[PDB]
Amino acid sequence: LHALLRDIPAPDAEAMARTQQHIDGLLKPPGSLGRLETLAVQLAGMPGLNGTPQVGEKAVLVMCADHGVWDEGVAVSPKIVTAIQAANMTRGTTGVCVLAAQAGAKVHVIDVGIDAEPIPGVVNMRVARGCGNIAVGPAMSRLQAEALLLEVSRYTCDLAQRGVTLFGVGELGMANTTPAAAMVSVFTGSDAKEVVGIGANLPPSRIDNKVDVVRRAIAINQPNPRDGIDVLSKVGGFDLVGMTGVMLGAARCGLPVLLDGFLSYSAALAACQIAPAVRPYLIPSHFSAEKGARIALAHLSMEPYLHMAMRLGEGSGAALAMPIVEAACAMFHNMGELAASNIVLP
Amino acid sequence: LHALLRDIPAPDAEAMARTQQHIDGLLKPPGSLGRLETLAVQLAGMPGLNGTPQVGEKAVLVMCADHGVWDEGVAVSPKIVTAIQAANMTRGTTGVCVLAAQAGAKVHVIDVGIDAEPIPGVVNMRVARGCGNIAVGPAMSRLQAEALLLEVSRYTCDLAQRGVTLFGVGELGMANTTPAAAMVSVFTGSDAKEVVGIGANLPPSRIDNKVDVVRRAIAINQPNPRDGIDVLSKVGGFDLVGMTGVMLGAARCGLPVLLDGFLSYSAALAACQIAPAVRPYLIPSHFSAEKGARIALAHLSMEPYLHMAMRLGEGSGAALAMPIVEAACAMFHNMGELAASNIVLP
Ligand SMILES: Nc1ncnc2ncn([C@H]3O[C@H](COP(=O)(O)O)[C@@H](O)[C@H]3O)c12
Numbered sequence: 102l103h104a105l106l107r108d109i110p111a112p113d114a115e116a117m118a119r120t121q122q123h124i125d126g127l128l129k130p131p132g133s134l135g136r137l138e139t140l141a142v143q144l145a146g147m148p149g150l151n152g153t154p155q156v157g158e159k160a161v162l163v164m165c166a167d168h169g170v171w172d173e174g175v176a177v178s179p180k181i182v183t184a185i186q187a188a189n190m191t192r193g194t195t196g197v198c199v200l201a202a203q204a205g206a207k208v209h210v211i212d213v214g215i216d217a218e219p220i221p222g223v224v225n226m227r228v229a230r231g232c233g234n235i236a237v238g239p240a241m242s243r244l245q246a247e248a249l250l251l252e253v254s255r256y257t258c259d260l261a262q263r264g265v266t267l268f269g270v271g272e273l274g275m276a277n278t279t280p281a282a283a284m285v286s287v288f289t290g291s292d293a294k295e296v297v298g299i300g301a302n303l304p305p306s307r308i309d310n311k312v313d314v315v316r317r318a319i320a321i322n323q324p325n326p327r328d329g330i331d332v333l334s335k336v337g338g339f340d341l342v343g344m345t346g347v348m349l350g351a352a353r354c355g356l357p358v359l360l361d362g363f364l365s366y367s368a369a370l371a372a373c374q375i376a377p378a379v380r381p382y383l384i385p386s387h388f389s390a391e392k393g394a395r396i397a398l399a400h401l402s403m404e405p406y407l408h409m410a411m412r413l414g415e416g417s418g419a420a421l422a423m424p425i426v427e428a429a430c431a432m433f434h435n436m437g438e439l440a441a442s443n444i445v446l447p
Numbered sequence: 448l449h450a451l452l453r454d455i456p457a458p459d460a461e462a463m464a465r466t467q468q469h470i471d472g473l474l475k476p477p478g479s480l481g482r483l484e485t486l487a488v489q490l491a492g493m494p495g496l497n498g499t500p501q502v503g504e505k506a507v508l509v510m511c512a513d514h515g516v517w518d519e520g521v522a523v524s525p526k527i528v529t530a531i532q533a534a535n536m537t538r539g540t541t542g543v544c545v546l547a548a549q550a551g552a553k554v555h556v557i558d559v560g561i562d563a564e565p566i567p568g569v570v571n572m573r574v575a576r577g578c579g580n581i582a583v584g585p586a587m588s589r590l591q592a593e594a595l596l597l598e599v600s601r602y603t604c605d606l607a608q609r610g611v612t613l614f615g616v617g618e619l620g621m622a623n624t625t626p627a628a629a630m631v632s633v634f635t636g637s638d639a640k641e642v643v644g645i646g647a648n649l650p651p652s653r654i655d656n657k658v659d660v661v662r663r664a665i666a667i668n669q670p671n672p673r674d675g676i677d678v679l680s681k682v683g684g685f686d687l688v689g690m691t692g693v694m695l696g697a698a699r700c701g702l703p704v705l706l707d708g709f710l711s712y713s714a715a716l717a718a719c720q721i722a723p724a725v726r727p728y729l730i731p732s733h734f735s736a737e738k739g740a741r742i743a744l745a746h747l748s749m750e751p752y753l754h755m756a757m758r759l760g761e762g763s764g765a766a767l768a769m770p771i772v773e774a775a776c777a778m779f780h781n782m783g784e785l786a787a788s789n790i791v792l793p
Pocket residue numbers: 175176177178182186272273274275276277278279299300301302303413414415474475476
């Protein structure tokens with residue numbers, strides 16, 4: 102793991118310089134395509150991409166797990182929904198599935214700790230049958246977290262060997278917005294009330310309790326904000342850990358990762374804490390309608406492209422943004438050149 | 448024309464009600480897909496769509512024209528760029544072309560008043576060789592405007608007969624951001640300085656002049672804000688007129704139109720002024736980096752989905768948003784049902 106971290110490549114400034122010059126020469130007023138230009142340059146700097154903005158195969162990794170904190174009354178979805186939806190992922194009927202198909206991306210469902218019998222068709226990396234209840238103790242051990250980080254990162258880089266050049270990250274786990282808020286509070290130093298949202302339709306009246314639970318998890322565990330692994334293990338979850346692992350794996354592989362919503366932001370905070378080198382590989386997708394989104398995003402210094410008021414999770418936002426990534430590539434490779442037309446623009 | 452306007456259909460509330468109920472039953476927490484749900488419902492209410500969110504063929508209409516106001520020093524692109532780029536549109540090398548291809552949409556280039564010899568391959572609807580210089584008089588006559596509105600609206604609805612279900616609107620015309628700002632100022636009652644932007648890289652030092660020119664156009668012409676046709680003819684342009692005509696045509700046809708950037712917002716303001724019935728058919732795409740964008744958008748009560756800092760025009764933003772429209776459809780038609788899984792969510 103120390104290996105893995107040490108070995109994350111820095112971006113290729115040379116390729117980036119070349120990209121910028123090429124972009125500037127395209128059939129348009131310089132800088133007119135704004136964030137699409139910036140995206141293209143970012144992509145060009147990713148080693149796994151071969152010095153140019155390009156997209157080969159696309160995969161969306163969905164990390165599923167249950168959480169002990171569900172027992173705290175913080176979630177209105179029945180616990181079993183994780184297992185059910187997990188199965189549905191295999192049938193292509195979920196929101197992420199449908200959006201992925203539309204983007205031409207494959208969905209990989211990974212069980213990192215669902216509290217149910219194994220589900221045929223789902224990738225098995227189960228840590229346990231749900232994580233510990235953070236309100237009264239840690240979600241898991243440091244060991245467990247590190248091992249999952251390792252296993253997921255490996256699985257991720259291995260897909261690269263099969264043609265995947267672009268990843269999307271997602272989750273599925275009833276009550277997971279609670280550990281997410283805890284993480285965000287810890288990393289950003291924001292008070293719980295400012296970051297705790299309604300999750301999956303939590304009734305407004307149940308908010309207070311959710312805020313109390315978050316506070317308790319923190320007081321009780323005393324996670325160290327300067328130690329991302331510390332935080333994840335204590336007040337995170339297996340799913341959260343898994344998402345952070347996708348991030349670490351893609352970065353080590355020198356490939357881009359599209360973030361999703363609130364849960365993904367929390368994992369991203371951890372990833373960057375653990376390895377700042379990860380940062381340049383991440384790509385925001387959309388702006389989650391979850392209350393703590395703005396805070397989380399500010400801390401990652403990220404500005405999402407899509408404003409859809411989405412709050413489903415599963416990596417749905419991630420899939421929705423893939424076409425954008427492809428557009429920056431098409432722009433780069435298929436547009437004509439100013440010089441070729443004899444056009445001269447300031 | 449009075450006919451045309453009279454005959455724009457209202458949205459089908461029945462279909463919309465049915466859509467909403469179907470959406471609520473999908474495999475997800477109610478309302479979790481936010482703006483994608485709202486979009487789907489909007490689409491369902493469009494008569495030309497057959498009671499359901501669906502997308503058949505896609506077309507992007509690019510209205511090209513020159514403006515007399517170019518002589519006022521308000522644009523740094525050489526006048527000839529309109530004609531050149533217009534030709535390029537036919538070769539598929541422009542930004543809109545590339546983005547359309549990626550969205551699977553066809554680009555239709557229409558010459559409504561380029562100041563050059565006709566361009567083979569381009570649809571010919573030329574009013575004149577460039578419009579009058581608004582700084583010293585009107586862009587054209589009311590007659591001319593009405594006729595173009597008519598011709599474009601017809602051409603638009605006719606495409607519907609060929610399978611097109613979704614339109615994108617765009618333009619090409621050196622100096623066109625000037626008439627655009629004038630229109631915006633007039634419709635919104637905002638002062639010119641607040642709405643005049645850099646257009647295609649206008650040097651910061653040249654701004655003042657642009658603001659003066661806009662003010663003059665207004666003082667000189669005295670356009671009536673309560674008469675959209677009045678405004679377009681006086682301080683608009685052939686391209687602006689043409690975009691408004693796409694809007695009127697799509698609406699009469701009961702079909703959706705995706706807006707583009709700043710120029711498109713100006714045309715949209717006119718369209719809604721002329722016929723409020725048009726409103727429900729319009730769909731924002733992105734949030735233009737042009738200074739007057741926020742003001743224009745506020746007046747249309749619209750919130751774009753995409754934040755790309757784009758400012759190219761041509762209908763580039765429009766094409767970029769098409770996949771989003773398709774995603775709302777896929778969601779609607781391909782997602783599984785809660786009931787089918789036995790899942791019950793508050
Ligand atoms: N709840 C859900 N039900 C059905 N399908 C879902 N897909 C995602 N979620 C979402 O709800 C969970 C977080 O919400 P909370 O903290 O309030 O429990 C996660 O599974 C998130 O993916 C779903």
